[PDB]
Amino acid sequence: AMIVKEVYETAEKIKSMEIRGAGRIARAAAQALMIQAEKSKAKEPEELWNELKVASKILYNTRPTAVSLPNALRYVMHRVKAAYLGGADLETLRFTAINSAKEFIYNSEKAIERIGEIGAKRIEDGDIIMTHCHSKAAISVMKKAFEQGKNIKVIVTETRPKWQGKITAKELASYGIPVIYIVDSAARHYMKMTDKVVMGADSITANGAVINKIGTSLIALTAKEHRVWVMIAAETYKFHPATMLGQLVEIEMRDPTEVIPEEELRTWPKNIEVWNPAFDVTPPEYIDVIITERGIIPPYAAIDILKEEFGWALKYKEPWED
Amino acid sequence: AMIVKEVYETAEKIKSMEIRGAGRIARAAAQALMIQAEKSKAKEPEELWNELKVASKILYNTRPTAVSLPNALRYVMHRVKAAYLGGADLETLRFTAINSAKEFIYNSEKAIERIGEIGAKRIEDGDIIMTHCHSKAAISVMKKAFEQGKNIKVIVTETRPKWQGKITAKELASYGIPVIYIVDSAARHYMKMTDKVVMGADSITANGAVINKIGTSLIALTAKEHRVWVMIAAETYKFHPATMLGQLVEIEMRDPTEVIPEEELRTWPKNIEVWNPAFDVTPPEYIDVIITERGIIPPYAAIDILKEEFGWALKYKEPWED
Amino acid sequence: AMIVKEVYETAEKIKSMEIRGAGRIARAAAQALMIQAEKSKAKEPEELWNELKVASKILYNTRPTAVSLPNALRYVMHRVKAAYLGGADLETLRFTAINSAKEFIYNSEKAIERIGEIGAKRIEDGDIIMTHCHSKAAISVMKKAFEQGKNIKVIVTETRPKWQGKITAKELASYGIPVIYIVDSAARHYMKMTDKVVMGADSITANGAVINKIGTSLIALTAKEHRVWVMIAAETYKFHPATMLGQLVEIEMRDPTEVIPEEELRTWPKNIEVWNPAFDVTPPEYIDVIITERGIIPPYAAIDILKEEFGWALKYKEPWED
Amino acid sequence: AMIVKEVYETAEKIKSMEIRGAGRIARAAAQALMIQAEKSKAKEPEELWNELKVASKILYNTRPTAVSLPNALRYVMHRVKAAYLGGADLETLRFTAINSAKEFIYNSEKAIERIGEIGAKRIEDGDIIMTHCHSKAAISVMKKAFEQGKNIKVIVTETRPKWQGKITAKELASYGIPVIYIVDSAARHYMKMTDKVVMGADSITANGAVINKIGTSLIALTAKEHRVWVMIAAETYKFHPATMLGQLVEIEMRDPTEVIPEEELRTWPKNIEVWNPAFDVTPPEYIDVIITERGIIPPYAAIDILKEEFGWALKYKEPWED
Amino acid sequence: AMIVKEVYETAEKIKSMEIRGAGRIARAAAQALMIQAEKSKAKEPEELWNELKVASKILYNTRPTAVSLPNALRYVMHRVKAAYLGGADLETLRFTAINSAKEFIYNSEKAIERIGEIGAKRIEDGDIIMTHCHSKAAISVMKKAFEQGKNIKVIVTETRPKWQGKITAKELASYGIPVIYIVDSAARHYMKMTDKVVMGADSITANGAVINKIGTSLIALTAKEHRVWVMIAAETYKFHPATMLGQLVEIEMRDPTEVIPEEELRTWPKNIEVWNPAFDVTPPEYIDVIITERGIIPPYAAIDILKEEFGWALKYKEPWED
Amino acid sequence: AMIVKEVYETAEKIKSMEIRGAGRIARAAAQALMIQAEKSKAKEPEELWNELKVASKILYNTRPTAVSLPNALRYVMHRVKAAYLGGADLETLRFTAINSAKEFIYNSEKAIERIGEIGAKRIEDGDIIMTHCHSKAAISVMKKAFEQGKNIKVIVTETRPKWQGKITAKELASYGIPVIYIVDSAARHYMKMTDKVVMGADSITANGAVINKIGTSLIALTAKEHRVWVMIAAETYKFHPATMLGQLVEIEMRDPTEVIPEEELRTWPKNIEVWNPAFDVTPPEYIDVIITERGIIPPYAAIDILKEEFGWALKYKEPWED
Ligand SMILES: Nc1ncnc2c1ncn2[C@@H]1O[C@H](COP(=O)(O)O)[C@@H](O)[C@H]1O
Ligand SMILES: Nc1ncnc2c1ncn2[C@@H]1O[C@H](COP(=O)(O)O)[C@@H](O)[C@H]1O
Ligand SMILES: O=C(COP(=O)(O)O)[C@H](O)[C@H](O)COP(=O)(O)O
Ligand SMILES: O=C(COP(=O)(O)O)[C@H](O)[C@H](O)COP(=O)(O)O
Ligand SMILES: O=C(COP(=O)(O)O)[C@H](O)[C@H](O)COP(=O)(O)O
Ligand SMILES: [K+]
Ligand SMILES: [K+]
Ligand SMILES: [K+]
Ligand SMILES: [K+]
Ligand SMILES: [K+]
Ligand SMILES: [K+]
């Protein structure tokens, strides 16, 4: 029992994609556990422990694909679970949760600035960069490159069905960056004039595969075809612990109405099924580098990032369950 | 100088894409010349000849890329010009136009049917077929395969920006064919479950390359990647004769507002440019077969088709020129 | 309805693969039509017609995959048919069938010796050559080159399940050509030391694909991987005219007992299915040349062989049909 | 110089392949070292040392290719050696050897059951899986996934020349897993209908190459061609430490009579050589993952498995050497 | 007996490469037979027939690789041989040779202008074109493109060992074309900034392979890697008749001193062999188009150019031999 | 301010390529700092420190691309700076420099030897090896393989523009190794007869890419094309640490006159530009192994080498900076 408004409203805003982008989802989730601990009227520590377990279950059960979300939850609740089981009283527990979530948030913010600085060294003056969807990590790189006086242009793919490309196009243009907007279908047509591709990630697997917005794997295919470097800009908390032990990342199937509006789809024949995967999977061979906040790695070093940050927790249960 | 309303109206409708599809555009243009000839008020054959040349020009200057259009005009106008030059009187010239236009129309209808009968033999029971845009020729293949009692399913790509996949989805469904509808970005994600690709063509070049709806070349790339047969259904008048002598096909750049609607687009800053190519070009190494009315060829035999039907004409100027 | 025993024996020996290899099968079918003509006890020219038609159907319904068989029955029966339809009397029909047979049979022998001569020029002193199955056309190339005193070695893949590779190993060893015999699985391992690959063909399609003994496509694939020339030695009567009109070649599935002897298989459980495809299909992009009796072609010129020698016959029914 | 008969029997049964498969061979060598320790009649701790050293050399000189065998002898003898060199007395050495054996033997069994559990997560309901040879690690993956109630089918390649594929077909059929049995040559033909490929390993090198039964590289190659995941199921003790210092793995060449029975071969001429390589080598770029008991790695992380578990031992001589 | 100075001096100037480039060699050879017929002091036709046979033998036996040479010789001597065997008297024979050689020369000149016009349509404004060696055909294309006001730049590879790149670089610069000169080794480094590759040919095979200056096949390899169109500019008389019947083109091995000067090479150890192939062979898959004077073909249509111009003469002896 | 003549002279000789090869340049730079420290007239440690910083800068500003140079300077200067900052007196600082420089030199000599011992194990009896430029590390491999009695032959590419293959040819010949010497353009022509490629490195990046003599990347491309192992012999100090944080390696553009001599070049028009990159970059997918002093790695493990030796240093400024 007993969860605050902010937890529920955040969960609904993740589901509906009013809060979106794997990094932002992650911070939002940490932010929500932070408000539950702030506002909780719990008296006992075991009461609050149980509230935070249940806030965490609600937040995890929103969108499955970007592992940034459970890694945020984990980051807070490994520390909440240790404090609680160590024998922390109420206010010690409240501070552990509140602070762990402030920690993760700040670190996510810092990781992205840093990804931008690292990645922008791989951008050269005159570069035409093609991007996909709307990824804060990818945009940090492009923004920094432009602030360094590299005269760049970005090809923004519209990113059907949900139009994330429109966000990207206005954001980059607002920083002063020349933009070329095209449909997703025009990616091979314009790969010849493209020098660099920069995209984000929702989950990165142990073998180096990249799960990112539907279409990503196509752009990467034709980038390889043309020898255009595919650079994936991605925080360490995009990497997927459980792929270490064989798990496949779930691909989120979103509502048909995102593709065909309700007003039109109801008029269509029964024998047409609309299928709307929100993500696809790009194989490591088509990735040049993964730019984390810890540096440039080849895609196959994803196992090392995981071995050293996340491996230890795979013998344990999730820090929010019974 | 004295041009019937039908010529102008056909022209407006081709430009606007109310009349669309390479094959249909070509028939509409014959038809238009047919009608100018039926309804001409001319008294001398010279006067009719002039109206036909001028109508031909109007029709040519509508859409560049689908060569079926100029080939239709040529079919009619080579015959009209040979009659005029050979001394024909007003009524014999009228008839040569009228009857030439009809022969093209009739031949076009028969060729789409025959293509269906031929391509269908390459479709097998249980096949999943992916297609792109709305191609009458490709549909004839799927439609016939289904009528032969092969249980097929078609993956239809929505085809941005103009949404031609909607036409295709609803049309195939009307015949009883199950459809799976997806965004263009999802073609690689679903290539693994696809057994055949079947698309159409606006122009085929001397070396075997296929100009078709923007996005076609991406679908073929990932099809090759996966060893899925790419079959292009396409009539002999889709073959481009000026490429035998080095010409490159012009790619139509259509209005930004087809991508981002007018309302929205004017709210955007200058430094975003919307680019809307209506076609791309697929190399012959990514085509398994071209299915024409005369049979199955590898794409490299495009030169043979062009030699034995269109080559004779490239010593002469255009049959509508002064 | 009065069919000589030789036709029945021939059909049965084609079925059991006692008579095997695509060219030899073809010659044996012509041979049977020849003996049916010779030994007939037909009063009328219509009684002979009817026997030949019936013998043809029996012979056609033995093994489907190697088009050689029907191209031979065609060669005879096109001529027998045209004779009977110009009102030929009896012994004029009998001789037509007898002399169409001999003519095809002799032209087969000449085409194979000529393929040798043309093919051997692409073999170079020292060459190591890998082959597959037992192909008399492939063997002619290898034998002639050794006769030219080029020092060659042949890698012979054993060719499961029916062990054709043993026939080849002994045949070549009998001309004094050193043989290296290996399992099929070992083709990649030895492809590094291989200089040329030379195989036969059962059917060759209009886009250049080559249907040949199960395994052939695997050898071709790793040959391409290593840039080893794949050379296909194939008479004109291996080219498959029905593929010009969209047809797909059928892949013979032979008895599971060829893989697991009947004694052993009956002891195995029901939930193991044994599948025994006798042919597979190699794409044209992995074939460097086809060596015919008319010359060397790229695989994609199969359509020209077909056009110029068989394309006429497709607009009519099979010559042995009613 | 006093070696118990069990060691000699074990060596001979490893040579004749009555005991086969890389993990089982390893366990049988540890088992033999264990029985030599148990049954020894050695007075001194140096007489036991000397017997174990000698037993080790005998066991090492049976089959070279599967590094499992020496990694097992190492595991025991590193510990037996360190004991004897710290002045251990007799029954302390005997127990060390006895308990190093049991410990390796049990850890082998656990690694294989864990590889099952990790591997099965990458199999999906409906999957068709191709394998090669008979690998207990590969089989554990397949068996566990069927135990999870995923409906799978396994394509089993017969694996010439020694027919290991028969052992696999019966083993899987015995757990109620539908089997499709085919010749090795047919792997490309059925790769289109295959969803996952799962094979074992005899040795795995420092750059990620996988040495496994002859044919394995061919399956991997056409799997890559078709974008079918190739998954290698391999205990840590299959990784080859000497490859870290440049060594190449030796490929066992076994008796020509395994290919052609002795009866038939003696009738064949001298100028046919029969070559029988028992393994081949697959490059890492064709391997999607290696499934170890410690997790899922990209093939290129083989060097980290080696570094962290064996790199120490390379600076000394083999533990059984003088 | 009895050959003029000009025949011998031309033969020596071909050998020494003072006359070079396959087209020019060809015209020079025709020019030489033309002077032998002009200046011959022969009295009988059979005398002159025999002089021209022997002039032709001397000219053929200079450099083997560019088939332009024997096709020039053939073009003259098919016509000389027919006139002579038809019963032509002296002056009829003299005129046949003189005129046939003037014919070939003029046609070669016209073919190159025409290749330039055709090819230049495939060059687009702003194009950076990479070329290799010095090819008149290739230079016609580039020159014409520049005369059309297309603002181009050419990357000229120096073309070791004989520095033909220096000729190319000065010739293009003298017409006004901006040039970038690089070593052969820098071709991949600069393929990313390259839009089009244009090279010539010495011989083109029946299957579409292109034999051209050593290095050509490398540039073509990396052009394919990057999707840069490889366009081969080549007269019909570059196509190689005898590859129709299996012949491999001979690759000319030129003197070691061209690579290492005599003054230096004499000082080098015996165990160093210098190898100097003057040409290599590019496979058809890396060629986009062959631009002949008859139009754009795919590389695989080389067989058609040969079938229709040269096929007929392969049943005959060379028109200069006994 | 007070710099010994040896520092300046070393600097001139590095720029001029009298001292050349990445490994030798690095030793020459340690050596130079060694000598400045031996011969300094300084009295305070501060004065010596300043001379060492200034000499370091002079040495750094010679050639950019081979990172071995800056790594050598760092090895010395990290140790010198830690001593200076930790309060060391004049003589203890002198000694730290002198002895640090010697340790680098000695370690470099030992590492080349060890690389040879390791790489040689990957060379097999009868191997043909192609190499490029003059690499001490690669030569150590070939030299050792030969000394082990493997009959090898080396194809040496001349390496324009500076002709480094001459050095390599004569050096390998001096050991008794047969050499085949070729122009760079001939690498694809001779790749079919090559068994191994063995080249060196100037810099290796975090993602595994190899910067080496211009032309290296072409040889590796066609090697991959042909399944010939590309082995890069290269010391740990060839690994580039600034690439871990996104830096791209600068490619040295050297003087036009190295390509075209001064005499000739001034006779050329303005509108020719000579471009002379001394390096190109080879992607990691085209490298089989890197052979370092610590063993064989796949190229993607470049990050591991960089992490465990150089990563610590990238929080600090350069140890020669103020
Ligand atoms: N759902 C998933 N979860 C994790 N990895 C995946 C998933 N789907 C595909 N992959 C991996 O991503 C790549 C897909 O390659 P392909 O199937 O060849 O497109 C491979 O490296 C797979 O291991
Ligand atoms: N000397 C030659 N004469 C004719 N064709 C050749 C010759 N050498 C190679 N080829 C062809 O050129 C291409 C060479 O491809 P590869 O050997 O894979 O480089 C193939 O299409 C061969 O048929
Ligand atoms: O795939 C998406 C968006 O998914 P959605 O819009 O469906 O959330 C983004 O590229 C990543 O999540 C990374 O973005 P960031 O770098 O901003 O985390
Ligand atoms: O596939 C086979 C034989 O199959 P099978 O044994 O099943 O008939 C041979 O490669 C071809 O028939 C060609 O042989 P030839 O060149 O002798 O026509
Ligand atoms: O290979 C060369 C030169 O060989 P070389 O210099 O050894 O004669 C040229 O590219 C062709 O011969 C075609 O040139 P063109 O188009 O001028 O015929
Ligand atoms: K590009
Ligand atoms: K598929
Ligand atoms: K080979
Ligand atoms: K598949
Ligand atoms: K380019
Ligand atoms: K090779």
Numbering used by the authors:
A (entry chain A), B (entry chain B), C (entry chain C), D (entry chain C), E (entry chain A), F (entry chain B): 3 to 324
How does the study describe this entry?
In summary, our study demonstrates that PH0208 protein would function as a purine nucleotide dependent R15Pi enzyme and not as a homologue of the regulatory subunit of eIF2B. In NMP degradation pathway, R15Pi catalyzes the conversion of ribose-1,5-bisphosphate (R15P, substrate) into ribulose-1,5-bisphosphate (RuBP, product) in an adenosine 5′-monophosphate (AMP)-dependent manner. AMP acts as an activator of R15Pi and in its absence the enzymatic activity has been found to decline dramatically. Monomer of PH0208 protein consists of an N-terminal α-helical domain (residues 1–122) and a C-terminal α-β-α sandwich domain (residues 123–324).
Thus, we determined the structure of PH0208 protein in complex with AMP molecule. The binding site of AMP lies at the interface of three monomers (chain A, B and D) of the hexameric protein. The side chains of Arg124 and Asp290 of chain A undergoes a shift towards AMP to form hydrogen bond with the O2′ and O3′ oxygen atoms of the ribose sugar. Another two residues of chain A, Arg229 and Trp231 are involved in interacting with the phosphate groups of the AMP molecule. The side chain atoms of Asn209 and the backbone atoms of Val251 of chain B forms hydrogen bond with the oxygen (O2′ and O3′) atoms of the ribose sugar and the nitrogen (N1 and N6) atom of the adenosine base ring, respectively. Along with chain A and chain B, AMP also binds to a third protomer of the hexameric protein through interactions involving the side chain atoms of Arg190 and Lys194 of chain D. Thus, one AMP molecule positions itself to hold three protomers of the hexamer. All the amino acid residues of PH0208 protein forming hydrogen bond with AMP are found to be absolutely conserved in R15Pi enzymes. The positioning of the AMP at the interface of three monomers implies that AMP might play an important role in providing conformational stability to the hexameric form of PH0208 protein. The change in the side chain orientation of Arg124 and Asp290 to interact with AMP portrays as the key interactions required for this stabilization.
